[PDB]
From a paper:
While α6β1 is expressed in the early stages of myelination and is crucial for the radial sorting of axons, α6β4 is predominant in the late stages and mature myelin. The two basal lamina receptors of mature myelin, α6β4 integrin and dystroglycan, known to be together responsible for myelin stability, are according to our results bound to the same scaffold protein, L-PRX, at the Schwann cell abaxonal plasma membrane. The third cytoplasmic fibronectin-type III ([name]) domain of β4 integrin (β4-[name]-3) was identified as a high-affinity binder, and the complex was characterized using biophysical and structural biology techniques. We have shown here with a collection of methods that L-PRX binds, through its C-terminal region, directly to β4-[name]-3 with high affinity.
Residue numbers in the entry: 1438 to 1449, 1455 to 1548
């Protein structure tokens, strides 16, 4: 099978760089804005993937962010006083850059 990006471009080397430190901003008691800086790449970025989970284990949630210009996402329904790990990496046509990890206690 041939997998394509959400934008339609075909997938499949100089990888994207790693994003800088993740910035977290609370929007209420259970909602969190996660922001980063677009990393450099010789090629066009297609977007980002954001994965997060409780540090102590739990279901891994994954979000695909299909705009290279979209460098933030708001996550909802988080558990107060629980610690999470977020990992963000940039995607190009040729593959994935390395992940930037950031952790936070809600």
């Amino acid at each position: 099978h041939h997998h394509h990006h959400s934008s339609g471009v075909d997938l499949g080397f100089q990888s994207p760089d790693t994003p800088t430190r993740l910035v977290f901003s609370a929007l209420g008691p259970t909602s969190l804005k996660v922001s980063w800086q677009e990393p450099q790449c010789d090629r066009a970025l297609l977007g980002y993937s954001v994965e997060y989970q409780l540090l102590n284990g739990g279901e891994m949630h994954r979000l695909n962010i299909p705009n290279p210009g979209q460098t933030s996402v708001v996550v909802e329904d988080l558990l107060p006083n629980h610690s999470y790990v977020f990992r963000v990496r940039a995607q190009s046509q040729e593959g994935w850059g390395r992940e930037r990890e950031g952790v936070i206690t809600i």
